[PDB]
Amino acid sequence: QRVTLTNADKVLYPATGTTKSDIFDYYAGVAEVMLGHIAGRPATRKRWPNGVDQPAFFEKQLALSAPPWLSRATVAHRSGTTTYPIIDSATGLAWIAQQAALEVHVPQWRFVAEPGSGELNPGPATRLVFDLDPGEGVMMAQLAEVARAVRDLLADIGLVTFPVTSGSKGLHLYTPLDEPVSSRGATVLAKRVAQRLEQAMPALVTSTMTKSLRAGKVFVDWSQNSGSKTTIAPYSLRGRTHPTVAAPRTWAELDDPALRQLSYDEVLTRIARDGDLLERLDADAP
Amino acid sequence: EQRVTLTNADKVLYPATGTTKSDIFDYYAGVAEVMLGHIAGRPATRKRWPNGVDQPAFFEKQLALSAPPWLSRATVAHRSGTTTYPIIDSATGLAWIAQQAALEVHVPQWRFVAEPGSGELNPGPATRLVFDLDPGEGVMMAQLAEVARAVRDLLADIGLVTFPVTSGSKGLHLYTPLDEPVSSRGATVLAKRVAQRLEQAMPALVTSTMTKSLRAGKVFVDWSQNSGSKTTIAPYSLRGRTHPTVAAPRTWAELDDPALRQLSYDEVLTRIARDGDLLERLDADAP
DNA sequence: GCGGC
DNA sequence: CGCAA
Numbered sequence: 001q002r003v004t005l006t007n008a009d010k011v012l013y014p015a016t017g018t019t020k021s022d023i024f025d026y027y028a029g030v031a032e033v034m035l036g037h038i039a040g041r042p043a044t045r046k047r048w049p050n051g052v053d054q055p056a057f058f059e060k061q062l063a064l065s066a067p068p069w070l071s072r073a074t075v076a077h078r079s080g081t082t083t084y085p086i087i088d089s090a091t092g093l094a095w096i097a098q099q100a101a102l103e104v105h106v107p108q109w110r111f112v113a114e115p116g117s118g119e120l121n122p123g124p125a126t127r128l129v130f131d132l133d134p135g136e137g138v139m140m141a142q143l144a145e146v147a148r149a150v151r152d153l154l155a156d157i158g159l160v161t162f163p164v165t166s167g168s169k170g171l172h173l174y175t176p177l178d179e180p181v182s183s184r185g186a187t188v189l190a191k192r193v194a195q196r197l198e199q200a201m202p203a204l205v206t207s208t209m210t211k212s213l214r215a216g217k218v219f220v221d222w223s224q225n226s227g228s229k230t231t232i233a234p235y236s237l238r239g240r241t242h243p244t245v246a247a248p249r250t251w252a253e254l255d256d257p258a259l260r261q262l263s264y265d266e267v268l269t270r271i272a273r274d275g276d277l278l279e280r281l282d283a284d285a286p
Numbered sequence: 287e288q289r290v291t292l293t294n295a296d297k298v299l300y301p302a303t304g305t306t307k308s309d310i311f312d313y314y315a316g317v318a319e320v321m322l323g324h325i326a327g328r329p330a331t332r333k334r335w336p337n338g339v340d341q342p343a344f345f346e347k348q349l350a351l352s353a354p355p356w357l358s359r360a361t362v363a364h365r366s367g368t369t370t371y372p373i374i375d376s377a378t379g380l381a382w383i384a385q386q387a388a389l390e391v392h393v394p395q396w397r398f399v400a401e402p403g404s405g406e407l408n409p410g411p412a413t414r415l416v417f418d419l420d421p422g423e424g425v426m427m428a429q430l431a432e433v434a435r436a437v438r439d440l441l442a443d444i445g446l447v448t449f450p451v452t453s454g455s456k457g458l459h460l461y462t463p464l465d466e467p468v469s470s471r472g473a474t475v476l477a478k479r480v481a482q483r484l485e486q487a488m489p490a491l492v493t494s495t496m497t498k499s500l501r502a503g504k505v506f507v508d509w510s511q512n513s514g515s516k517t518t519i520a521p522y523s524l525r526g527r528t529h530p531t532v533a534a535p536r537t538w539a540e541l542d543d544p545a546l547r548q549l550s551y552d553e554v555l556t557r558i559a560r561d562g563d564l565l566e567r568l569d570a571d572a573p
Numbered sequence: 574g575c576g577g578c
Numbered sequence: 579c580g581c582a583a
């Protein structure tokens with residue numbers, strides 16, 4: 001399981017001058033905290049081999065040139081069959097870094113070993129994700145107002161909620177399901193939460209997806225629980241002009257009106273101090 | 287009903303001549319009927335220039351996961367690892383080669399064969415010898431031909447026919463069909479001996495020995511191209527040089543020309559019309 | 574040139 | 579970024 005880094009000093013984030021070597025070291029540092037939330041899960045990559053300025057691509061299928069030691073499982077979808085890599089070692093993330101795969105994306109479900117035979121099919125969703133996407137001119141004080149409303153709705157079913165800023169524009173809320181439930185079921189539940197909130201605070205929340213997002217409201221993206229969709233993984237970098245991170249936050253932080261996204265270097269600092277704030281999210285692991 | 291969509295039609299791949307992807311596509315469409323027989327049943331190695339002859343290139347042997355399911359494919363087992371190659375055997379296969387910016391197509395001297403009992407394909411014997419003539423420092427294309435002629439006779443003196451093909455590069459290729467096919471090992475044995483009998487017959491102009499440098503004033507007869515693991519630029523293939531030259535089959539009379547030169551895709555097209563396939567007898571069979 | 578349902 | 583030996 002050697003991974004040779006190449007183009008160490010190649011700048012991928014021109015704005016901040018972030019070389020592949022930083023990124024390699026970043027993913028080396030976040031490894032212990034990150035791995036648990038992507039283990040057992042099919043890794044979708046979004047790659048910027050030529051920096052965040054040159055075009056990028058999504059990649060699901062594991063290339064034929066990908067190192068044999070990587071874990072892999074197949075998903076069967078209407079037309080075609082996709083074999084994804086499963087990242088579950090620090091070396092796996094090393095590969096991800098070398099690959100210039102800034103972003104790692106996962107669904108909310110894990111592969112499970114077939115009782116009799118052995119090899120893996122997609123299993124039930126282990127967690128819900130609430131994908132909060134702010135509208136035009138949507139105040140931060142209010143984005144959290146909503147996140148808190150979601151938390152209080154879920155705790156009224158004995159479910160805990162963890163906020164993670166996306167590294168992008170909005171906010172993600174994860175909820176562990178002690179007893180896993182199929183993605184359709186996950187979708188059903190998320191959808192009911194969204195709709196119950198939309199009703200409880202009409203002026204700030206919408207459950208309905210719109211081709212151009214709605215001004216002044218927060219859109220609760222419940223269909224992110226569809227077993228066929230992925231959400232940016234916790235502790236992943238983003239391919240934005242600045243190397244921000246999908247970063248877990250404490251609830252206390254959400255009370256900050258001047259709340260903002262975090263950079264890879266800052267997250268690193270926090271981990272040292274904090275540990276994995278999402279520790280109880282995926283307390284079982286491949 | 288295998289389709290190939292051309293993308294980036296007007297994208298110039300040879301800046302010097304302004305030859306766009308669409309020219310190349312059309313070329314391969316045009317050379318298809320004559321080219322296909324010499325590469326059918328053979329593992330296609332591609333050398334690709336997706337950004338013109340000025341941007342870097344790569345060899346590709348393995349058939350990518352992303353390539354169209356309708357391509358033919360067989361597998362070769364080697365040292366460590368296994369390689370599934372594409373087999374080009376229809377104009378559409380060539381279409382794919384063009385869309386792929388795979389200027390060059392390289393093949394070995396052998397074909398896959400259907401397994402007598404089971405069906406699927408393992409490497410078979412070599413169907414033809416190839417003599418790869420590599421001229422040295424200050425070697426006049428004239429004397430390069432005398433050597434080519436000397437090879438023809440040594441071979442005719444065993445009832446074997448010889449077809450010349452200019453590589454589209456610097457030197458010259460000779461193919462000989464083997465009526466009865468023979469393992470590449472044996473093909474190498476045969477070629478090595480022709481080369482050596484030649485080296486002796488004309489000491490001043492030929493060498494059989496591979497030098498790291500290329501020896502001035504002499505023509506090196508590359509016999510080891512008959513090795514089963516090696517490939518030679520396929521006849522009718524484009525080259526990825528500053529100019530869009532081609533591995534062109536030439537008639538013997540042409541080799542007598544001292545001002546004998548390489549040919550461009552356009553010329554090969556006008557030749558093929560008037561000529562048919564000069565190599566028609568080289569591979570009389572296969573898809 | 575291609576890499577996502 | 580990787581694509582042959």
Ligand SMILES: O=c1ccn([C@@H]2O[C@H](COP(=O)(O)OP(=O)(O)OP(=O)(O)O)[C@@H](O)[C@H]2O)c(=O)[nH]1
Binds near residue numbers: 133166168169170
């Ligand atoms: O075009 C898309 C859009 C979305 N997605 C998947 O859906 C997830 C959520 O899609 P979002 O559009 O909400 O983006 P985001 O949450 O990552 O960041 P912000 O909205 O805060 O700006 C993304 O993280 C990605 O995994 C795609 O794969 N492709």
Ligand SMILES: O=c1ccn([C@@H]2O[C@H](COP(=O)(O)OP(=O)(O)OP(=O)(O)O)[C@@H](O)[C@H]2O)c(=O)[nH]1
Binds near residue numbers: 518519
């Ligand atoms: O580095 C190499 C060299 C050669 N080869 C393969 O073996 C053959 C060796 O052939 P040559 O190296 O002699 O080049 P050529 O005959 O194509 O062109 P000239 O000599 O006329 O300039 C080539 O046609 C190619 O298929 C490689 O695959 N890689």
Ligand SMILES: [Mn+2]
Binds near residue numbers: 131132133166170171
């Ligand atoms: Mn979002």
Ligand SMILES: [Mn+2]
Binds near residue numbers: 131
């Ligand atoms: Mn969304």
Ligand SMILES: [Mn+2]
Binds near residue numbers: 418419453457458
């Ligand atoms: Mn040569």
Ligand SMILES: [Mn+2]
Binds near residue numbers: 418420508
């Ligand atoms: Mn040679």
